[PDB]
Design a protein around this ligand. Sequence first.
Ligand SMILES: O=c1ccn([C@@H]2O[C@H](COP(=O)(O)OP(=O)(O)O[C@@H]3OC[C@H](O)[C@H](O)[C@H]3O)[C@@H](O)[C@H]2O)c(=O)[nH]1
Length: 585
Amino acid sequence: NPSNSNLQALREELCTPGLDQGHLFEGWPETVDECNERQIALLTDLYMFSNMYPGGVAQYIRNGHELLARESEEVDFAALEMPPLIFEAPSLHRRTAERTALENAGTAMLCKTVFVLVAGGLGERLGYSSIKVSLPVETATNTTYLAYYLRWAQRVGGKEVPFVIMTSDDTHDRTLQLLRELQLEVPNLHVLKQGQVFCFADSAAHLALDETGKLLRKPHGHGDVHSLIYNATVAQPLVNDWLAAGYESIVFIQDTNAGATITIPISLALSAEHSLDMNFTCIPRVPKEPIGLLCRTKKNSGDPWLVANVEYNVFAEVSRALNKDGFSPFPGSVNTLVFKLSSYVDRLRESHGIVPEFINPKYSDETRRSFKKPARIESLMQDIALLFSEDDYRVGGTVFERFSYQPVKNSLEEAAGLVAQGNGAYCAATGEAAFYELQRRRLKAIGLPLFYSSQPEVTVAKDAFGVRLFPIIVLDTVCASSGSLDDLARVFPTPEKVHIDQHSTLIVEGRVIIESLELYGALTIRGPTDSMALPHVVRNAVVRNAGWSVHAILSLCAGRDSRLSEVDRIRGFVLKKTAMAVMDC
Ligand SMILES: O=c1ccn([C@@H]2O[C@H](COP(=O)(O)OP(=O)(O)O[C@@H]3OC[C@H](O)[C@H](O)[C@H]3O)[C@@H](O)[C@H]2O)c(=O)[nH]1
């Protein structure tokens, strides 16, 4: 679009004191016409940034100056204490009256919930070169995180469930590819791609270039999700469509935490019970943990309290300073965010989805602003909490068991180092192991008599630590529906007649009811894919076979070939699916 005249205007503007981007036009002709195609392209690139960032590149640079000055100082709050509105969730593995009440109320609320998945990252830091949502939740079925979230959402919210996936330049095309390949049909899905922002080569906010001579770009953070939604349309605003359709809540989830499908119904139920406009999903926190703390804050002695996440790195600094004169007192936020939709939209409309920003440069050496790598401005999706004043809104946190938090974020190497420090591994191995264990704890809670050893069955990361997998029991969304305890009880109506040996594998797909079963081995039971069809009922079943086993990937891993994939290598073991009985119909 941009005219030759506007590009010249921007070029000159960027050369003025306070912006000082003269280095960009190093060795250029005096007018636009005289400029070549590269040059005209770089200027156009600077120009079009206006349709991507408030105030375009000039304002980006000013914001940079302001933030670089800010982060050179010592962050600190005048006041910091426990959030007033904190609520304890009942255990996920005890079927009490309260848990039943919360799950059923929360599950009803899922019918009027909008879901948002932030998935703008690759899993390279894990040793995985593909998109994180293509990681399998477990390798028994190999169900991807993407399919896991979407099928659950379509199960609890119906086929036409409103669903947003935020992607980035890194993940976007592969996300679309995965959607297509999995044959997922989600009529009201919106894939919204965040744009990358320019980078600063130095502490004076001079823009960085790559080797090609083009402007360097990096992600602006998960904070982008709110503005992407604010600007999205179907042509009325996206959120208008949701409100008018009767939707009442909106939930934000991250890319590799399968626990969200359990915590969410409870958070919704509690949000309603306690009239919460924003509800942070939390867990008891360990002092050495890369998750934020939910705190009541007063930035300056003048301001009103604000309930907000204080990122781990920042609380590592504020903590160490001042006071007015075995977990953290304050909850750890896992970034499953639950909102009342009307309140969310109000704040969204007011802010245009813009949340406070920050910059966090990595320095070449200890104490001079020579960047090790170019820095850019970032934002966090949870910082939208800062737009909810205590006067007008109720922002709180729900505390769940730590076990319900199951992210896959660390490589095997990192996990080994973390485990040595007594910290959580949060790697692919413990993610998969935790998923299987979660199913077992949920099933035992409704009376399924599962007897199994607590000992690890395989060791990973050079014998650093072990996990166990068996017994493996995976029920799909047609079988288990929402996964509530009541829903599980529909699959096992007489659980005391179901005897699954500790070494067994049970995979259930479609409309299945298991009344009685003795299983010593691996079994797949399939029923109708239609949730409304007549169930396949299993009675007096006895199945014995060699079943499955698991073993570690050996250190002697070089080879012309092997069928080990990155997916295998990042968890350090492989299931051997030796035998399998199938009961169809
Ligand atoms: O530009 C981006 C960057 C990320 N994400 C996505 O954002 C999500 C998180 O990214 P993360 O796991 O890399 O780590 P964080 O440490 O930043 O996030 C913490 O997570 C844990 C605590 O709650 C803590 O308070 C909370 O802030 C992923 O799904 C990404 O795909 C995007 O969609 N775009």
